[PDB]
Amino acid sequence: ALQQLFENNVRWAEAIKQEDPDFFAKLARQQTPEYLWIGCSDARVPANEIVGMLPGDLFVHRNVANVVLHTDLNCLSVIQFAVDVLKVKHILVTGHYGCGGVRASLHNDQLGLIDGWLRSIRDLAYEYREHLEQLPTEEERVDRLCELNVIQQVANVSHTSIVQNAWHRGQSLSVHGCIYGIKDGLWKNLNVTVSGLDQLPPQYRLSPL
Numbered sequence: 575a576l577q578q579l580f581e582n583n584v585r586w587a588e589a590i591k592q593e594d595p596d597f598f599a600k601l602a603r604q605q606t607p608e609y610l611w612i613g614c615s616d617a618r619v620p621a622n623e624i625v626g627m628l629p630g631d632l633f634v635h636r637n638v639a640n641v642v643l644h645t646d647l648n649c650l651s652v653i654q655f656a657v658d659v660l661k662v663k664h665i666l667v668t669g670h671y672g673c674g675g676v677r678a679s680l681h682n683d684q685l686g687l688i689d690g691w692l693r694s695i696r697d698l699a700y701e702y703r704e705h706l707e708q709l710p711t712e713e714e715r716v717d718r719l720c721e722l723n724v725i726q727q728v729a730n731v732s733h734t735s736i737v738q739n740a741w742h743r744g745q746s747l748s749v750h751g752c753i754y755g756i757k758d759g760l761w762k763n764l765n766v767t768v769s770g771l772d773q774l775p776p777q778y779r780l781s782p783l
Protein backbone atom coordinates (compact mmCIF):
# COMPACT_ATOMS: atom_id res chain seq x y z
CA ALA A 575 0.00 0.00 0.00
CA LEU A 576 1.43 3.33 -1.19
CA GLN A 577 -1.64 5.32 -0.19
CA GLN A 578 -0.15 5.73 3.29
CA LEU A 579 2.84 7.60 1.91
CA PHE A 580 0.75 10.03 -0.14
CA GLU A 581 -1.52 10.66 2.82
CA ASN A 582 1.51 11.15 5.05
CA ASN A 583 2.89 13.72 2.60
CA VAL A 584 -0.33 15.72 2.28
CA ARG A 585 -0.48 15.95 6.08
CA TRP A 586 3.23 16.82 6.45
CA ALA A 587 3.06 19.57 3.84
CA GLU A 588 -0.20 21.04 5.21
CA ALA A 589 1.20 20.96 8.77
CA ILE A 590 4.29 22.90 7.72
CA LYS A 591 2.15 25.48 5.83
CA GLN A 592 0.02 26.15 8.93
CA GLU A 593 3.08 27.04 11.00
CA ASP A 594 4.59 28.87 7.98
CA PRO A 595 2.61 29.10 4.71
CA ASP A 596 5.64 30.44 2.80
CA PHE A 597 8.04 27.72 3.97
CA PHE A 598 8.23 25.87 0.65
CA ALA A 599 7.92 28.94 -1.59
CA LYS A 600 10.93 30.49 0.09
CA LEU A 601 12.98 27.28 0.01
CA ALA A 602 12.26 26.79 -3.71
CA ARG A 603 13.87 30.09 -4.66
CA GLN A 604 17.52 29.09 -4.22
CA GLN A 605 19.92 26.28 -3.30
CA THR A 606 22.30 27.15 -0.48
CA PRO A 607 23.15 24.07 1.55
CA GLU A 608 26.35 24.41 3.55
CA TYR A 609 26.90 20.63 3.79
CA LEU A 610 27.23 17.62 1.51
CA TRP A 611 26.37 14.35 3.21
CA ILE A 612 27.97 11.20 1.83
CA GLY A 613 26.50 8.22 3.64
CA CYS A 614 25.11 4.71 3.41
CA SER A 615 21.81 3.78 1.76
CA ASP A 616 20.89 1.85 4.97
CA ALA A 617 17.33 2.89 5.92
CA ARG A 618 18.35 3.42 9.55
CA VAL A 619 20.78 6.25 8.72
CA PRO A 620 18.70 9.16 7.34
CA ALA A 621 20.88 12.28 7.14
CA ASN A 622 18.66 15.24 8.04
CA GLU A 623 17.06 13.68 11.12
CA ILE A 624 20.37 12.42 12.55
CA VAL A 625 21.92 15.89 12.74
CA GLY A 626 18.65 17.80 13.14
CA MET A 627 18.74 19.67 9.82
CA LEU A 628 15.94 21.05 7.65
CA PRO A 629 15.09 20.64 3.97
CA GLY A 630 17.56 22.91 2.11
CA ASP A 631 20.50 22.33 4.52
CA LEU A 632 22.06 19.02 3.38
CA PHE A 633 22.95 18.07 -0.21
CA VAL A 634 22.91 14.24 -0.08
CA HIS A 635 24.45 11.20 -1.72
CA ARG A 636 23.81 7.74 -0.38
CA ASN A 637 25.12 4.44 -1.72
CA VAL A 638 25.81 1.02 -0.22
CA ALA A 639 28.48 1.43 2.47
CA ASN A 640 29.22 5.10 1.62
CA VAL A 641 31.97 4.37 -0.88
CA VAL A 642 33.77 7.08 -2.87
CA LEU A 643 35.50 5.61 -5.94
CA HIS A 644 37.74 7.59 -8.22
CA THR A 645 36.02 6.44 -11.41
CA ASP A 646 32.44 6.63 -10.14
CA LEU A 647 30.81 9.54 -11.90
CA ASN A 648 27.65 9.09 -9.79
CA CYS A 649 29.22 10.06 -6.45
CA LEU A 650 31.88 12.28 -8.07
CA SER A 651 29.22 14.35 -9.86
CA VAL A 652 27.42 15.01 -6.58
CA ILE A 653 30.72 16.09 -5.01
CA GLN A 654 31.65 18.20 -8.03
CA PHE A 655 28.27 19.91 -8.12
CA ALA A 656 28.33 20.45 -4.38
CA VAL A 657 31.88 21.87 -4.37
CA ASP A 658 31.92 23.79 -7.66
CA VAL A 659 28.37 25.05 -8.04
CA LEU A 660 26.74 25.02 -4.61
CA LYS A 661 30.00 25.84 -2.81
CA VAL A 662 29.22 23.77 0.26
CA LYS A 663 31.63 24.41 3.10
CA HIS A 664 31.72 20.85 4.49
CA ILE A 665 31.60 17.33 3.11
CA LEU A 666 30.37 14.95 5.78
CA VAL A 667 31.51 11.37 5.09
CA THR A 668 29.35 9.31 7.47
CA GLY A 669 29.56 5.55 7.73
CA HIS A 670 27.75 3.54 10.39
CA TYR A 671 28.43 0.65 12.74
CA GLY A 672 26.96 -2.73 11.79
CA CYS A 673 27.03 -1.79 8.09
CA GLY A 674 25.84 -4.69 5.91
CA GLY A 675 28.05 -3.62 3.02
CA VAL A 676 31.10 -3.64 5.26
CA ARG A 677 30.02 -6.92 6.86
CA ALA A 678 29.57 -8.70 3.52
CA SER A 679 33.11 -7.64 2.53
CA LEU A 680 34.42 -9.56 5.55
CA HIS A 681 32.63 -12.70 4.48
CA ASN A 682 32.89 -14.93 1.41
CA ASP A 683 29.30 -15.16 0.21
CA GLN A 684 28.55 -13.86 -3.27
CA LEU A 685 25.78 -11.28 -3.15
CA GLY A 686 25.90 -10.58 -6.86
CA LEU A 687 26.50 -7.29 -8.64
CA ILE A 688 27.18 -5.54 -5.34
CA ASP A 689 30.30 -7.79 -4.91
CA GLY A 690 32.18 -5.51 -7.32
CA TRP A 691 30.90 -2.38 -5.62
CA LEU A 692 32.23 -3.44 -2.20
CA ARG A 693 35.56 -4.89 -3.35
CA SER A 694 37.42 -1.75 -2.20
CA ILE A 695 36.32 -2.55 1.36
CA ARG A 696 37.61 -6.06 0.82
CA ASP A 697 41.00 -4.50 -0.13
CA LEU A 698 40.89 -2.58 3.13
CA ALA A 699 40.19 -5.72 5.13
CA TYR A 700 43.18 -7.40 3.42
CA GLU A 701 45.35 -4.33 3.97
CA TYR A 702 44.48 -4.32 7.70
CA ARG A 703 44.17 -8.10 8.18
CA GLU A 704 46.88 -8.17 10.88
CA HIS A 705 44.98 -5.52 12.86
CA LEU A 706 41.54 -7.11 12.32
CA GLU A 707 42.80 -10.62 13.20
CA GLN A 708 43.73 -9.29 16.70
CA LEU A 709 40.07 -8.39 17.39
CA PRO A 710 38.24 -11.23 19.17
CA THR A 711 34.62 -10.89 17.91
CA GLU A 712 33.17 -10.45 14.41
CA GLU A 713 31.06 -7.46 15.47
CA GLU A 714 34.29 -5.83 16.58
CA ARG A 715 36.02 -6.53 13.27
CA VAL A 716 33.00 -5.29 11.33
CA ASP A 717 32.79 -2.14 13.47
CA ARG A 718 36.49 -1.35 13.20
CA LEU A 719 36.35 -1.94 9.43
CA CYS A 720 33.37 0.48 9.32
CA GLU A 721 35.68 3.08 10.87
CA LEU A 722 38.62 2.29 8.58
CA ASN A 723 36.27 2.56 5.62
CA VAL A 724 35.07 6.07 6.56
CA ILE A 725 38.69 7.19 7.08
CA GLN A 726 39.59 5.82 3.66
CA GLN A 727 36.66 7.55 1.93
CA VAL A 728 37.66 10.87 3.54
CA ALA A 729 41.11 10.45 2.00
CA ASN A 730 39.50 9.56 -1.37
CA VAL A 731 37.29 12.67 -1.34
CA SER A 732 40.29 14.85 -0.40
CA HIS A 733 42.43 13.42 -3.22
CA THR A 734 40.03 14.39 -5.98
CA SER A 735 41.08 17.26 -8.22
CA ILE A 736 37.60 18.61 -7.50
CA VAL A 737 38.47 19.23 -3.86
CA GLN A 738 42.10 20.17 -4.52
CA ASN A 739 41.12 22.73 -7.17
CA ALA A 740 38.67 24.30 -4.67
CA TRP A 741 41.55 24.73 -2.24
CA HIS A 742 43.80 26.07 -5.03
CA ARG A 743 41.32 28.86 -5.74
CA GLY A 744 41.04 29.76 -2.05
CA GLN A 745 37.66 28.20 -1.38
CA SER A 746 36.97 27.10 2.23
CA LEU A 747 36.14 23.39 2.31
CA SER A 748 36.54 20.68 4.93
CA VAL A 749 36.07 16.94 4.51
CA HIS A 750 35.02 15.21 7.71
CA GLY A 751 34.73 11.58 8.74
CA CYS A 752 31.99 10.52 11.15
CA ILE A 753 30.40 7.22 12.10
CA TYR A 754 26.79 6.71 13.15
CA GLY A 755 25.70 4.25 15.83
CA ILE A 756 22.49 2.49 14.76
CA LYS A 757 22.31 1.04 18.29
CA ASP A 758 22.39 4.39 20.12
CA GLY A 759 21.52 7.11 17.63
CA LEU A 760 24.85 8.85 18.15
CA TRP A 761 26.82 10.56 15.35
CA LYS A 762 30.49 10.44 16.29
CA ASN A 763 33.47 12.33 14.91
CA LEU A 764 36.39 10.12 13.84
CA ASN A 765 38.55 13.27 13.86
CA VAL A 766 40.13 12.85 10.43
CA THR A 767 39.13 16.23 9.02
CA VAL A 768 41.07 17.53 6.01
CA SER A 769 40.77 21.19 5.06
CA GLY A 770 43.78 22.00 2.87
CA LEU A 771 46.46 20.83 0.45
CA ASP A 772 49.20 20.73 3.07
CA GLN A 773 47.54 17.72 4.70
CA LEU A 774 47.71 15.48 1.61
CA PRO A 775 50.58 13.06 1.00
CA PRO A 776 52.87 14.24 -1.84
CA GLN A 777 51.87 11.26 -3.98
CA TYR A 778 48.30 12.58 -4.15
CA ARG A 779 48.86 16.32 -4.53
CA LEU A 780 47.93 17.80 -7.88
CA SER A 781 49.34 21.07 -9.22
CA PRO A 782 46.94 23.96 -9.96
CA LEU A 783 45.49 24.37 -13.46
Ligand SMILES: [K+]
Pocket residue numbers: 615616617618
Ligand atom coordinates in the same frame (compact mmCIF):
# COMPACT_ATOMS: atom_id res chain seq x y z
K1 LIG B 1 18.30 -1.07 5.30
Ligand SMILES: [K+]
Pocket residue numbers: 741742769770771772
Ligand atom coordinates in the same frame (compact mmCIF):
# COMPACT_ATOMS: atom_id res chain seq x y z
K1 LIG C 1 44.91 24.60 1.02
Ligand SMILES: [Zn+2]
Pocket residue numbers: 614615616638639640670672673674675676
Ligand atom coordinates in the same frame (compact mmCIF):
# COMPACT_ATOMS: atom_id res chain seq x y z
ZN1 LIG D 1 25.60 0.53 5.54
